[PDB]
Design a protein around this nucleic acid. Structure first.
Lengths: 158, 148, 288, 55, 97, 111, 49, 299
RNA sequence: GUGCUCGCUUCGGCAGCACAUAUACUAAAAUUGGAACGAUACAGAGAAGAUUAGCAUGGCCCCUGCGCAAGGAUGACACGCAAAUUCGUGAAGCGUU
């Protein structure tokens, strides 16, 4: 009721009923999607959070490893929490994070080890290469020729 | 077209160099605007007058030259906007009021002319201005209004 | 110099993960258009991608109303040339460098004195929505845009660094394709943008109101009504277009014939009455 | 903003004299005067100075 | 004074540029509502949360850009209406003297 | 490398800076080149300071190579600091060094 | 061409301060272009007598 | 409205002193800052004795003693006049999430920890008198009014009530779906307020003669986010209003009778961990993770 | 990966727990434009006759210099058919009411 909608920096404590009650009247049709959203700057609403460093960083890491995360938004519907993204793997992997003992632990890649540092030109501690997938890749007998064409076609321009 | 553009470029550069050196010499602006007017490049001429107003808006002769150029080319609404701006910024320049009414009178907009006259009388102008308004009604025999 | 605390960025650039780490570098690079230094923000948009950065300052971004990185439009994600041409709009901003500098300071003066948080000066010239833009606009991301660059050594055929290689090992687009020759300036001003041209030609082929050459029939046919739409529903919609007096319905076709007092009203009616027309959840086909 | 160090002194002062006289001649004229002949008044000052030196 | 002393400090910061490195770690979070909401765009969420870190300026890097380049100055503010009294009648006799 | 890059950045490539921080020109200059290459006292002071380091450091190099006795090294450094005017020309570009240059002569006489 | 200034006055209206605009609509009215007539016009004719 | 900056970290807990004239605040910075309520709201303490995060503050009913439960595995007892750490109870193997001192004398204290133990104390003795072993972590404990019962809420969702005399679990309450971050008992002792991570605040009949279903009232409208903080709950002194911490930055006060919101006050930037009422005047303080305390009059 | 597991239970493998928890202007490149004297022809230095010290003034002109010093021909340029609003007298001839 008694509080302006065009308001900032309210000096007193307004009651719920005198601040959250609706604006009356019909909406205009003359406003596009960007124009109707409550933006503070040209693309959206930016406001300073103070979210705890360990919890931000954990969830952020979690999405990169799997593709699910717990929703950071702070209104949406105030009713029930959900995961986001590939939600099927959230229920599947029992909602773990990276900072936990994983459920899957299989099919590890194999590498050399010569942890002695006594044979010169034979030591490789943490610089060990995987044994299967190996240096000096080139993609084809014939794709090379097609890339030769493309570089030749570039020569015809200049 | 190249010789025409080179003639344009050479002349404009000499005008701009003279304007950069002699900004307060308003007569340089008029020469440039009149040269574009001779080329009928009205869109360039318009911008020269507006830029010239930014240096000395009070120069009466500058407003006149701008308004005259629009009237000649039948761009009546552009000229109206120039007169309406002029009377708001420079109400004491009597000449503007007379010329504005004179446009409406030639166009036969006897009604519109009155509005310019009525808004003028609000400022309480000199005696001679009133007589022009009186004579306006007298030319059209509205004796009872002339009385009021 | 432009010092801003947050970059104007679209959702596709911003990334698929809602937890973002980004670094703020004051005056790190010059703006690709106006050459003024600006605050550069750089972020990793996802698991495998380019680790993007802002290319143009917010000033240039405000004027067009575009994302600082991709330069696609914050309302639709289309390119600038498509959006302005659809509204028959044109930009008066000068093309030569010296006059552009003059114009730059003017807009700086305007944004500093006005509210400045708004496109509304440039948007105000053409605020109207158009059916062309709403059809073309992306409803969904295009993350493929974000994918890493092509490995130049791999194209040479001697790709050292092996399968570690974060750059893509796939064929580049053929140089004879006109779509390769793009320029940021040309995309920004909206001149000879090949991506725009492809869109506009395609969009032009979309169906349209052909019948009005029948200049003295004024009756509309509408098809697909079912049994689940009343006369009154139909009559209300047609009444917004104009003046009417005939309604007749053929139940075997499930079609109506409705006649306007003028063809002009009928043609005005037909403008809305395309694939936009939905009543009671049924989408209807309009004929003369 | 380069300074009036030493060699600049006499040329600077003669500018400030003439710039001051410009202000007075604008103010002293009645408001309906022909907005000219300012340069003519200055040339009389330069002549009066020369006559003073020559006695 | 708070308004001026701050602007003072930005001027005074020029006077001694190299007396020490600046120290900078105010790594702040801001919460953001993207305006152009949709079911697909954010992978689901209505909002996204962003960590801001000011990047470490290299002490030894010289000024990157040209500052001295002069530009044509923009036109002024819109002209104020002239509120004078009516032009009082000049006479021929005084005009001659 | 620093003073070398500063020359090449201005494309004054007709000047040469040698490994003992002399600057000499490879040809007779035009007036316009001679104007463009007239570095100020700030550049020349820093160059001559670097010369004074190299005379010190190379003396230590000569000793570590075994080309000179340790006793020769000591007399070498002593010679440098007494004679920095004669050996480096610094006082051309900053006249106040005639304080220090005198004082080293006094110390020379004293010791 | 090796110049930073010059040719810009041929590409567009150089310093297009728009006319002020209000109370009468005047986006509509527009003017006849210059009659070229490049078979009689002379350099003396553009400058005038 | 008054703003109280100056905590370097998250503010987990805040309590008014029982006489209303002074205020205590503490949190992630490990310091306990004592504020005057009236005048310029100035500070006049740093309490320094802890080595880890202060999880909860409680005064004794006369106000001479301040109790601070900490993640450092210790409970500190402070003299409010001098600021001396009077004693250090050091009996717990894991983080101390909560404490609460007895309403009636003697000076008993009870505690809940992540080691799954609920330990009773007596300030006279250096060791725990009794330990009840819960199967899972305990997030909040309070006494009842009669000082004979410990009520504990934990991550096992159920509310558990022990009896110190029989040394046995005596009744349990079921209905909450998630971890009970906060418990608080009304000044009359009849009712308990509970906050849980299932986005519900509830009032339970703690009296001996309750119906079999003890849940009397359910309140909604707070949010628990991904930080999973221990959002606390408090009663108004008259029992007419309840407050709950919420992670959506809004400060919630409900009317207990009408079950409506009455104030939903913006302005914090982070999760609000605890909200406290002043005992006599209608002043409310809310402690948030934005490193600020906001204090303001309500009507 | 390491250590501990009164772990299978051998010294082979696997499981659990504890500690340990997210570098990189991501290239060894492909590109894109704008620049350095200085030679080639051309080009000649202000003050009303001539030979000349200069100090100024103005700005999308710079160079040299650490400079709020000082030089660059007085650093160059400025040299201009330098026309801005708004009229009336007096007689003489011709045509019209």
């Amino acid at each position: 009721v008694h509080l302006d909608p065009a308001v900032k920096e309210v000096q007193y404590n307004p009651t719920y009923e005198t601040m959250f009650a609706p604006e009356f009247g019909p909406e205009n049709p003359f406003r596009t999607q960007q124009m109707a959203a409550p933006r503070n700057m040209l693309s959206g609403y930016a406001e300073p959070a103070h979210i705890n460093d360990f919890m931000f960083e954990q969830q952020r890491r979690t999405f990169a490893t799997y593709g699910y995360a717990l929703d950071p938004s702070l209104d949406n519907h105030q009713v029930s929490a959900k995961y986001i993204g590939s939600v099927e793997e959230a229920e599947k992997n029992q909602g773990l994070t990276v900072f936990e003992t994983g459920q899957k632990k299989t099919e590890k890649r194999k590498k050399f080890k010569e942890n002695d540092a006594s044979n010169i030109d034979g030591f490789l501690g943490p610089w060990a290469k995987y044994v299967d997938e190996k240096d000096v890749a080139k993609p084809s007998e014939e794709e090379q020729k097609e890339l030769d064409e493309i570089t030749a076609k570039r020569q015809k321009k200049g | 077209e190249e010789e025409l553009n080179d003639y344009k470029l050479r002349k404009r550069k000499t005008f701009e160099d003279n304007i950069r050196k002699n900004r307060t010499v308003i007569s340089n602006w008029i020469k440039y605007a009149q040269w574009e007017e001779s080329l009928k490049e009205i869109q360039r001429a318009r911008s020269i007058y507006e830029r010239a107003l930014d240096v000395d808006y009070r120069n009466i002769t500058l407003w006149l030259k701008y308004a005259e150029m629009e009237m000649k080319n039948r761009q009546v609404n552009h000229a109206r906007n120039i007169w309406d701006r002029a009377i708001t910024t420079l109400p004491r320049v009597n000449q503007f009021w007379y010329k504005y009414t004179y446009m409406e009178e030639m166009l036969g907009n006897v009604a519109g002319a009155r509005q310019v006259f009525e808004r003028w009388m609000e400022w309480q102008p000199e005696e001679q201005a009133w007589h022009s308004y009186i004579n306006f009604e007298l030319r059209y025999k509205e004796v009872d209004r002339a009385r009021t | 110099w432009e010092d801003a605390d947050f970059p104007i960025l679209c959702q596709t650039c911003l990334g698929e993960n809602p937890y973002i780490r980004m670094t703020k570098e004051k005056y790190g690079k010059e703006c690709k258009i106006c050459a003024r230094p600006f605050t550069v923000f750089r972020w990793c948009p996802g698991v495998r991608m380019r680790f993007k950065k802002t290319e143009v300052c917010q000033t240039c971004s405000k004027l067009k109303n575009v994302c600082q990185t991709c330069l696609l439009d914050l309302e639709y994600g289309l390119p600038i040339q498509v959006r302005d041409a659809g509204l028959s709009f044109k930009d008066d901003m000068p093309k030569s460098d010296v006059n552009k500098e003059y114009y730059t300071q003017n807009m700086e003066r305007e944004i500093s004195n006005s509210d400045g948080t708004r496109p509304v000066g440039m948007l105000g010239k053409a605020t109207s929505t158009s059916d062309m833009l709403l059809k073309l606009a992306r409803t969904t991301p295009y993350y493929k845009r974000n994918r890493p660059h092509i490995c130049s050594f791999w194209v040479k055929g001697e790709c050292k660094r092996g399968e570690e290689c974060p750059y893509r090992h796939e064929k580049p687009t053929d140089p004879d394709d006109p779509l390769a020759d793009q320029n940021i300036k040309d995309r920004y001003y909206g001149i000879n943008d090949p991506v725009a041209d492809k869109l506009l030609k395609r969009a032009s082929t979309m169906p349209r109101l052909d019948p009005p050459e029948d200049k003295t029939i004024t009756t509309l046919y509408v098809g697909g009504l079912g049994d689940t739409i009343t006369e009154t529903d139909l009559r209300n919609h047609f009444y917004q277009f104009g003046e009417i007096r005939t309604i007749t319905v053929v139940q075997r076709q499930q079609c109506a014939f409705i006649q306007f007092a003028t063809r002009q009203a009928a043609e005005v009616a037909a403008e809305k009455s395309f694939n936009k027309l939905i009543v009671n959840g049924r989408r209807l086909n309009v004929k003369w | 903003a380069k300074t009036v160090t030493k060699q600049r002194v006499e040329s600077h002062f003669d500018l400030e004299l003439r710039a001051a006289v410009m202000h007075d001649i604008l103010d002293m004229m009645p408001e309906g005067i022909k907005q000219n002949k300012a340069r003519t008044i200055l040339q009389h000052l330069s002549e009066a100075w020369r006559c003073w030196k020559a006695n | 004074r708070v308004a001026l002393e701050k602007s003072v400090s930005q001027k005074v910061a020029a006077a001694m540029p190299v007396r020490a490195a600046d120290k900078l770690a105010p790594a702040q979070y801001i919460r953001y509502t993207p305006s152009q909401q949709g079911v697909a765009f954010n992978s689901g969420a209505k909002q996204r949360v962003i960590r801001m870190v000011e990047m470490q300026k290299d002490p030894m890097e010289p000024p990157r850009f040209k500052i001295n380049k002069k530009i044509p100055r923009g036109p002024p503010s819109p002209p104020a209406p002239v509120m004078h009294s009516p032009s009082r009648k000049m006479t021929v006799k005084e005009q001659q003297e | 490398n620093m003073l070398n890059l500063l020359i090449h950045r201005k494309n004054l490539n007709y000047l040469h800076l040698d490994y003992n921080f002399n600057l000499k020109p490879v040809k007779t200059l035009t007036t316009k080149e001679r104007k463009k290459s007239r570095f100020g006292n700030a550049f020349h002071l820093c160059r001559e300071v670097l010369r004074l380091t190299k005379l010190v450091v190379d003396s230590h190099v000569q000793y570590r190579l075994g080309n000179v006795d340790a006793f020769q090294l000591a007399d070498g450094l002593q010679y440098i600091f007494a004679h920095v005017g004669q050996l480096t020309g610094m006082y051309r570009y900053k006249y106040k060094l005639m304080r220090q240059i005198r004082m080293c002569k006094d110390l020379k006489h004293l010791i | 061409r090796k110049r930073k200034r010059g040719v810009d006055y041929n590409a567009e209206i150089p310093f297009e301060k728009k006319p002020a605009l209000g109370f009468y609509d005047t986006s509509e009215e527009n003017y006849q272009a210059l009659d070229a007539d490049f078979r009689k016009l002379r350099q003396q004719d553009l400058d005038g007598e | 409205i008054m703003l109280l900056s100056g905590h370097e970290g998250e503010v987990y807990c805040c309590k008014f002193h029982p006489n209303g004239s002074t205020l205590a605040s503490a949190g992630f910075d490990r310091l306990i800052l004592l504020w005057n309520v009236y005048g310029d709201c100035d500070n006049y303490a740093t309490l320094k004795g802890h080595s880890g995060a202060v999880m909860e503050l409680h005064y004794n009913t006369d106000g001479s003693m301040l109790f601070s439960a900490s993640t450092d595995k210790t409970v500190a007892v402070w003299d409010s006049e001098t600021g001396e750490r009077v004693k250090r109870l050091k009996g717990h193997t894991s983080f101390v999430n909560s404490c609460y001192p007895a309403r009636r004398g003697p000076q008993l204290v009870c505690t809940g920890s992540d080691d799954g133990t609920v330990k009773l104390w007596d300030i006279r003795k250096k060791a725990a008198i009794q330990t009840f072993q819960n199967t899972y972590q305990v997030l909040a404990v309070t006494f009842n009014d009669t000082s004979d019962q410990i009520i504990s809420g934990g991550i096992d969702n159920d509310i558990k009530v022990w009896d110190l005399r029989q040394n046995k679990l005596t009744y349990t309450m079921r209905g909450h779906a998630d971890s009970v971050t906060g418990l608080s008992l009304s000044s009359e002792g009849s009712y308990l307020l509970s906050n849980a991570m299932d986005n519900t605040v509830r009032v339970w009949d703690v009296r001996p003669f309750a119906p079999k279903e003890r849940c009397v009232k359910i309140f909604q409208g707070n949010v628990h986010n991904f930080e999973k903080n221990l959002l606390r709950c408090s009663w108004s002194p008259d029992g007419s209003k309840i407050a709950a911490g919420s992670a959506d930055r809004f400060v919630y006060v409900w009317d207990t009778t009408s079950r409506r919101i009455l104030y939903k006050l913006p302005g914090h930037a982070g999760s609000i961990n605890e909200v406290a009422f002043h005992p006599d005047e209608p002043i409310i303080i809310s402690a948030s993770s934005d490193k600020r305390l906001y204090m303001g009059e309500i009507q």
